[PDB]
RNA sequence: UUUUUU
């Protein structure tokens, strides 16, 4: 008998189940009747601690925003297990008493899919020792797929490891979103062990539904129908949840689209400092988004936080150049996409020379790196379009990059 | 014929034209490069 | 029996040592506190140390390196009378006997100061202040070339030829993001640890990647103080101020200090963040009064005739699309006297070190080179100038790779 | 806000 399980089941099954004993009211009455029997009730959600010291368990069906079925978590419970915003909580609950408006948490069974006692003893995210990415996250399916081309080129141009802090940088309509979707598919197939989250900020609503029905993971969104205030709050919840999972030695990946628009939202809510950078960006506005992107890191103790976010350039607005260059000096991987290549309908429209990854020797074998190095020396003299036409025709001849390398010989 | 085991041209074969002037058949363009005697091995 | 020595030792050895005098449940900080108190009960002396920071009220505390010289729980109170006695000032490394806090107190107190800047306390009363030291151009060359025929040594060798570094230099590794500035600074740090172990090496990391902090502290043989981009600008400023004052104190003791700063452009941004608005803003969004403080920070580096020196090699950013960084870079160029430029064009071809030879250089390089060394570098620059950026580096690296040292390379030039 | 940023 769980609250979110009742919220998921269709109304028809709920009405039948309640007769055996608005939809929100069906669930409420069913839960109360089960409480009358003396049987236990259960609920769950991600914790959000308010300023007063108490918190609520937000639900995914409300994008982790305030919801009618939110579960109150008392301050004493938060202090007992050192809970912090982002902690996924599951436990026994009770309907609200007279003069109350919320379900209350009686006992916490699970904190971050683990024993509550262990959440008292753990090393905090702020204290984890950072590292450059060690373990390679290979995107190439190898299934000889035509979509796989995007993954294969990615592996050659800008490898991705666990804890990477990368950017898919390109002008509007260059292929950033679909490239992020290609990455999401590659992650679900090649790395089902990783905890995949897709954060969509200030982007098209149809892409939200396209992404949640396409990726095998969790999708949190805040479309351009929403104000900047909402974008910020939602992103903060998601990033804190990632940090908690990393404290449990998990390999989390966040595909963010778009991080440029998230930075704009921060610039919208930031207190005016009396100093404004070129493009209309407050001098203090990029500190918060910089810490958000900089969350991504490799941990020596165990686990990692990867963030692959899309960024905008050549928008005519200098603000986006500032944001992009600031994030480049924060991260360590950029896959550039060219409008010139995309207008010729050449996909993936990847600017090979501008793309790249820092310390890529930590993510590649000795000979793989030597082969990529040659390949770059060969592609550099070519034009943006010529480079991709050349590379895609050569890769299309084989199923995998390994066979392509063997052809180079 | 000559084999290259050092640098980018490692794991490749070729022929010495005349330091050793050895070209490597890479992709679809010959790359003539000069390697030391130890940088390459006889075929 | 020293506080920081107890903080360094693992908890296992601390619990065993304390049981010899239940500690398993309590936090490590408590183990140290209880152990220190018990030793004080015996009448035996206790000791502590740290860098001084004087508050506005006239008293100070001894900050610790494990807190990046910020406020810490184990900070040692230094009474105003102690500061006046020995003319102590913020940055002074202090070592002395300490006592646990009494009832109504929250801090360890300093009984007697044994050592002020690794020297006798009386000598700190009598010294010439940093503001009064007579400045000079760099005299003593700090040669970076290992000579071990290493492939990393290439970066050092080119550096020696393009922009020599002397004691008291005020230099900049200028380049766009991902051109090689940080790794070049790491190469410099290695060369300093091997060729100049006498110099006091400090590595200040401001607003840069966190993995580089741990990479640097496990790589360089020196002290590493950091304030990553996870940190606000306020923290960057305060940390940098502590480090620069500590350097000045050591130079007052005729020491040759070197500060490798990455990045000084971001430090200048932090100053612009906390500076009071003047109602006048320069090109790129930089307050008209914002660069005075960072300019004094970079300008601290100088050669002293009386003895010792302060060198600062800091990285700067260019071609970021943000005019602010061009302003900061050009302002620092008119402050310093050495710039090693790195090119994004060379770096994209994977040619390292990606050094822009023509743009690099050092002022008064004749004070850092022999007569013939300077003549050979001069000829070499005349030859490299007509070449392109990339062609210049490929040519020079292929020629240098033929020999182990620059001296043999010069002998080849003949 | 304008100017400055340009
Ligand atoms: N001397 C070098 N040899 C090989 N690779 C280098 C060298 N210098 C830089 N690189 C490559 O460039 C990348 C970024 O260099 P970095 O020093 O971080 O530049 P910046 O500090 O200007 O951002 C590194 O991850 C490394 O792969
Ligand atoms: F218009 Be695209 F999504 F940047
Ligand atoms: F991105 Be580099 F460190 F300037
Ligand atoms: Mg898009
Ligand atoms: Mg760097």
Describe what you observe in this structure.
- The structure is cut from a larger assembly and holds two copies of chain A and one copy of chain B (43 residues).
- Chain A has 409 residues and is an alpha/beta fold.
- Chain A has two domains: 1-120, OB fold (Dihydrolipoamide Acetyltransferase, E2P); 121-409, Rossmann fold (3-Layer(aba) Sandwich).
- Helix content of chain A is 41%, strand content 21%.
- Chain A has 16 helices and 16 strands.
- In chain A, strands 6, 7, 8, 9, 10, 13, 14, 15 and 16 form a nine-stranded mixed β-sheet that branches.
- In chain A, a hairpin with an 8-residue loop joins strand 4 and strand 5 (103-111).
- In chain A, helix 2 runs parallel beside helix 3 and helix 10 packs antiparallel against helix 11.
- The relative contact order of chain A is 0.12.
- The termini of chain B are close together.
- Chains in contact: A-B, A-C.
- Bound molecules: adenosine-5'-diphosphate, beryllium trifluoride ion (2 copies) and magnesium ion (MG) (2 copies).
- One magnesium ion binds next to helix 7 of chain A.
- Chain C binds one RNA strand of 6 nucleotides through strand 11.
- Chain B: Belongs to the NusG family.
- Chain B: Keywords: Transcription, Transcription antitermination, Transcription regulation, Transcription termination.
- Chain B: Monomer. Interacts with the transcription termination factor Rho and with RNA polymerase.
- Chain B: Residues 1-18 form the KOW domain.
